[PDB]
């Protein structure tokens, strides 16, 4: 299970290696693209042909505040091959750049998307849409509460338009933390936890919504159309998980070829001190939740000794990527041949620790080729810059 070295990246924080890099790594056609901060804080872009181990790197004109692990880089390609980059935010004015040509590691100047409510950004994320268009999501904090703002890029028009200004509504009462995925049909999947207070221990529940029409109209998994915006009272609950359950925020989710959502997270049971990894999914008929791990070591959120997970699905076959102090903080794989039967195997994918690392993966490679590639780097949360690798993952023997 092979480990392709890219270049040295910043390792003194987990900025290159958070679960919410959407994306760190992206394939189009026969090429794969990557982004990270180098040891000196510069935004580096890379590309390769997928059949090669040789990366072409470009140190761009931009830097980021690498001492803050929130200040991540997200990238994506549109249907014409232009790279879109957004980076370096913890409640700051939008940093957004496009490549100057398709398939080329040359960034233009920073530019607005719509110019509206772009003053206080955190957590930029890109998703591909049908027709080569893009979705952008970010957390806007300008109101005093983190609000989900969603834009659509038309690749033909070379233009961004707002889609949703108020999709999840905390009613000046509660907070919300979300993750998304665009499936192989072009449907946007959305899931989130609520948080009653400002403190992480009041994280509760997993809610869900989807949109088939690029974010305009929204549906529940049970088929009912949403009245917007989505509040505590009308949200579809994928799973109930109470406050003070060590429920974590900002994880990941995926979907299978049938458009069914799967959500990967962790929390602990009422009668346990031990948080466990979970999978929450809708099979076209109903919601399910299951425990993936069999941990025995407590921790509390009130660095975290386990990583927030990533998942990919192939017709009920599940690859569930994690990192855990119980397994020496290696890159680890929890694999299920069939999600519905719940027989999991556990396999370490690295023989060395990656400490603060959380997984991000090449979402488009998995969709287009059913190959699972991870962004892998040893980070901490003074440590010399460590190699960034791409690791291909296959089912275990």
From TrEMBL:
It comes from the Bacteria. InterPro entries: Sialidase_sf (IPR036278). The keyword Signal applies. Pfam families: BNR_4. Keywords: Signal. This is Neuraminidase. It comes from Bacteroides cellulosilyticus DSM 14838.
């Amino acid at each position: 299970q092979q480990l392709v070295e890219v270049g040295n990246g910043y390792s003194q924080t987990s900025v290159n290696t958070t679960v919410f890099r959407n994306n760190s790594l992206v394939t189009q056609g026969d090429e794969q693209y990557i982004s990270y901060y180098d040891g000196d804080g510069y935004l580096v872009l890379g590309k390769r042909k997928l059949d090669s181990d040789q990366w072409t790197l470009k140190r761009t004109q931009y830097k980021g505040n690498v001492k803050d692990a929130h200040n991540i880089i997200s990238m994506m390609l549109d249907g014409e091959g232009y790279l879109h980059l957004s980076f370096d935010h913890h409640g700051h004015k939008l940093n957004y750049c496009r490549s100057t040509a398709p398939y080329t590691l040359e960034l233009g100047d920073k530019e607005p998307m719509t110019g509206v409510d772009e003053g206080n950004v955190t957590y930029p994320e890109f998703y591909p849409l049908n027709g080569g268009d893009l979705l952008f999501v970010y957390r806007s904090g300008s109101s005093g509460r983190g609000n989900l703002v969603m834009n659509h890029y038309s690749v033909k028009e070379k233009k961004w338009n707002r889609v949703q200004d108020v999709l999840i509504d905390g009613e000046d009462q509660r907070n919300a933390y979300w993750q998304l995925y665009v499936d192989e049909q072009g449907t946007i999947h959305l899931s989130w936890v609520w948080r009653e207070t400002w403190h992480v221990e009041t994280n509760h529940d997993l809610c869900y919504a989807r949109s088939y029409d690029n974010g305009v109209t929204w549906y529940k998994a049970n088929g009912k159309k949403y009245d917007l915006p989505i509040r505590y009272n009308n949200a579809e609950y994928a799973c109930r998980i109470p406050q003070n359950s060590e429920l974590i925020n900002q994880t990941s989710m995926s979907a299978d070829a049938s458009g069914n959502p799967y959500i990967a997270t962790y929390w602990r049971d009422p009668d346990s001190e031990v948080p466990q990894y979970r999978i929450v999914w809708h099979d076209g008929q109903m919601w399910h939740n299951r425990q993936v791990s069999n941990r025995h070591t407590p921790f509390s959120l009130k660095m975290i000794p386990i990583a927030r997970p990533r998942i990919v699905v192939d017709g009920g076959e599940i690859f569930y990527i994690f990192r855990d102090e119980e397994r020496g903080s290696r890159v680890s794989l929890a694999h299920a041949a069939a999600v519905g039967v719940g027989k999991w195997t556990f396999t370490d994918l690295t023989n060395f620790p990656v400490d603060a690392w959380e997984p991000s993966h090449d979402t488009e490679l998995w969709k287009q080729k059913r190959r699972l590639h991870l962004f892998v780097q040893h980070t901490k949360q003074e440590f010399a810059p460590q190699p960034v690798y791409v690791l291909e993952v296959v089912k275990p023997k």
